[PDB]
Amino acid sequence: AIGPVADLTISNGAVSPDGFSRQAILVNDVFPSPLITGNKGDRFQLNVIDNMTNHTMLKSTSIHWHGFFQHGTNWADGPAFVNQCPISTGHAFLYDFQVPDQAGTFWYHSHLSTQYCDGLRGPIVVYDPNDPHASLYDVDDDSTVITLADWYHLAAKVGAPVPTADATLINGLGRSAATLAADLAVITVTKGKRYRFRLVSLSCDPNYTFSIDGHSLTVIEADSVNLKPHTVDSLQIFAAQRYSFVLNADQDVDNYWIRALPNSGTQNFAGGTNSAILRYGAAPVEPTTSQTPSTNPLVESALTTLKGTAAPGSPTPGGVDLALNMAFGFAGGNFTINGASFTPPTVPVLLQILSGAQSAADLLPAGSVYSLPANADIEISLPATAAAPGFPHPFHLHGHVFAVVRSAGSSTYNYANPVYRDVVSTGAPGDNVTIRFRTDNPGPWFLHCHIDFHLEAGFAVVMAEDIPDVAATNPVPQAWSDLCPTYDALSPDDQ
Numbered sequence: 001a002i003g004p005v006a007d008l009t010i011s012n013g014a015v016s017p018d019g020f021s022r023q024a025i026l027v028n029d030v031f032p033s034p035l036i037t038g039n040k041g042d043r044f045q046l047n048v049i050d051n052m053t054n055h056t057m058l059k060s061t062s063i064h065w066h067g068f069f070q071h072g073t074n075w076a077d078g079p080a081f082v083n084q085c086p087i088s089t090g091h092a093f094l095y096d097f098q099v100p101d102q103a104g105t106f107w108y109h110s111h112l113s114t115q116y117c118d119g120l121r122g123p124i125v126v127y128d129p130n131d132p133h134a135s136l137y138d139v140d141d142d143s144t145v146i147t148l149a150d151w152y153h154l155a156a157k158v159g160a161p162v163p164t165a166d167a168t169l170i171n172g173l174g175r176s177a178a179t180l181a182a183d184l185a186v187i188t189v190t191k192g193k194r195y196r197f198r199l200v201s202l203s204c205d206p207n208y209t210f211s212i213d214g215h216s217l218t219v220i221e222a223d224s225v226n227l228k229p230h231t232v233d234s235l236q237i238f239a240a241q242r243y244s245f246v247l248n249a250d251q252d253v254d255n256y257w258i259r260a261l262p263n264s265g266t267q268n269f270a271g272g273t274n275s276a277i278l279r280y281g282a283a284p285v286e287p288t289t290s291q292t293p294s295t296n297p298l299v300e301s302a303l304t305t306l307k308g309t310a311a312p313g314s315p316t317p318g319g320v321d322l323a324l325n326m327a328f329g330f331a332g333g334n335f336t337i338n339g340a341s342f343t344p345p346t347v348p349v350l351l352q353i354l355s356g357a358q359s360a361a362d363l364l365p366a367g368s369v370y371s372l373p374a375n376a377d378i379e380i381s382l383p384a385t386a387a388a389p390g391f392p393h394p395f396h397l398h399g400h401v402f403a404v405v406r407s408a409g410s411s412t413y414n415y416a417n418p419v420y421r422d423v424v425s426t427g428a429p430g431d432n433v434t435i436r437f438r439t440d441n442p443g444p445w446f447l448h449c450h451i452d453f454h455l456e457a458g459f460a461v462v463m464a465e466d467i468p469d470v471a472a473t474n475p476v477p478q479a480w481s482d483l484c485p486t487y488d489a490l491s492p493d494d495q
């Protein structure tokens with residue numbers, strides 16, 4: 001309902017999404033963060049005005065626009081100390097970028113420390129006037145956006161380092177163990193109408209097993225990539241993933257439970273926890289519908305792109321220009337990738353390159369940056385392992401969509417017609433989730449676990465793609481150049 005040109009004023013305030021009051025982060029004075037929309041190929045101009053006064057949740061901020069390639073605008077990607085210095089409080093900063101060739105469901109979130117868990121996170125929809133699936137549904141609007149999110153009664157820097165959620169929020173509303181009377185979200189449908197629901201995980205940690213009582217879900221989009229329609233009776237959605245599904249409201253007029261079962265914390269539905277309501281003329285009361293066992297769950301390896309696009313490269317292991325393997329580990333309270341743990345450098349990686357850094361060995365942090373050649377095929381394997389606790393780890397690559405040639409829970413490789421997405425579960429020990437992309441987007445791009453508490457503990461690397469062309473391809477506005485001198489002048493209590 002706002003965008004693609006809009007102010008986003010960030011501030012602190014009290015919120016009670018699950019009937020429990022706590023300080024949090026507001027965007028345009030609301031929680032949860034408001035929906036942003038625009039059309040395929042639009043210019044987005046999002047002026048982030050930072051008015052936060054709470055140091056415990058960080059006064060500074062930085063917003064990542066999740067899913068957007070940001071070609072030519074790497075300075076706008078969001079990750080703190082990779083792509084920019086944070087916006088300092090009392091200041092504003094204009095994100096100004098274009099989305100050529102992209103349409104689907106996205107989201108925006110703080111990409112500073114674990115700040116987005118404290119409430120700076122909202123959905124984005126990029127509509128396609130010529131959406132190949134337009135004819136599959138009648139309704140696609142603000143009312144068909146469904147968000148899932150974990151919620152904590154103690155703030156990110158106040159609770160335990162890897163906390164347990166007190167509530168699942170659906171559209172920013174949910175119940176906790178001790179607030180069984182808190183208002184539930186209601187999604188309204190009219191009988192006989194078909195709905196494009198856009199489901200987005202704003203989660204800081206858990207994945208949700210999502211289903212709707214009595215209804216099947218026709219999945220048509222994954223992480224902004226159009227699919228061949230695939231009908232399931234449930235799906236598992238990892239932090240930061242998006243699915244569009246078509247729901248045919250063809251059941252009896254009634255109330256039906258919408259269910260989102262987390263993989264940790266409260267793993268039931270007692271008292272309407274982990275739930276929202278699908279309401280057709282039906283009475284304004286809770287559903288009393290029953291969960292049927294899932295017999296046709298979403299299986300990632302059975303998803304394919306609408307076009308049937310082959311994976312980049314030739315159909316054999318290591319059949320690409322560069323193949324990398326990321327060996328996960330954990331030691332000293334810190335995650336490692338190939339022995340190195342990510343620590344935010346004081347000079348953002350993008351500025352280091354603009355400043356004359358020529359190679360990965362030059363780039364800080366040492367051991368955490370990988371140089372990638374321009375205009376090439378890349379293959380990255382992310383073998384899951386017990387040495388990295390809190391699996392399954394959903395990994396996200398910035399600036400790119402990738403082919404998932406091998407999915408979690410599958411022993412097979414698909415090079416011919418694999419799903420493409422931008423967040424992938426690396427699964428359980430024994431898995432070897434394997435991705436391929438093309439280096440068509442010069443810049444440093446974060447590659448990290450989207451469990452935010454893991455990223456904070458260093459579960460991340462930086463892909464420095466086509467270093468020689470970074471500066472020329474990504475001219476920076478003066479307001480971006482001013483970020484670091486402003487931030488570095490702040491005393492630590494104001495950060």
Ligand SMILES: *[C@@H]1O[C@H](CO)[C@@H](O[C@@H]2O[C@H](CO)[C@@H](O)[C@H](O)[C@H]2NC(C)=O)[C@H](O)[C@H]1NC(C)=O
Nearest residue numbers: 022023024054055056057153154155156158159
């Ligand atoms: C700034 O934000 C923090 C973290 O949200 C607030 O921390 C609360 O601190 C009080 C008193 O120590 C505790 O009772 C709460 O449990 C904390 N809240 C959370 C969500 O962890 C702090 O109060 C905020 N500052 C101001 C001035 O409002």
Ligand SMILES: *[C@@H]1O[C@H](CO)[C@@H](O)[C@H](O)[C@H]1NC(C)=O
Nearest residue numbers: 317318325381382383431432
């Ligand atoms: C995963 O696949 C990569 C690339 O083929 C390979 O090098 C690595 O040994 C594999 N790891 C495991 C644990 O299977």
Ligand SMILES: OC[C@H]1O[C@@H](O)[C@@H](O)[C@@H](O)[C@@H]1O
Nearest residue numbers: 021022153154155157158159
């Ligand atoms: O950090 C949580 C704290 O919140 C305060 O408001 C009190 O309720 C304390 O008993 C408690 O220790």
Ligand SMILES: OC[C@H]1O[C@@H](O)[C@@H](O)[C@@H](O)[C@@H]1O
Nearest residue numbers: 316317318319322323324325
């Ligand atoms: O013995 C290990 C070596 O085995 C060879 O057959 C190749 O596959 C090499 O990539 C590998 O390093």
Ligand SMILES: [Cu+2]
Nearest residue numbers: 064066240396
């Ligand atoms: Cu993200």
Ligand SMILES: [Cu+2]
Nearest residue numbers: 065066067398
């Ligand atoms: Cu992203």
Ligand SMILES: [Cu+2]
Nearest residue numbers: 393449451454
């Ligand atoms: Cu993780």
Ligand SMILES: [Cu+2]
Nearest residue numbers: 079396446448
């Ligand atoms: Cu990221």
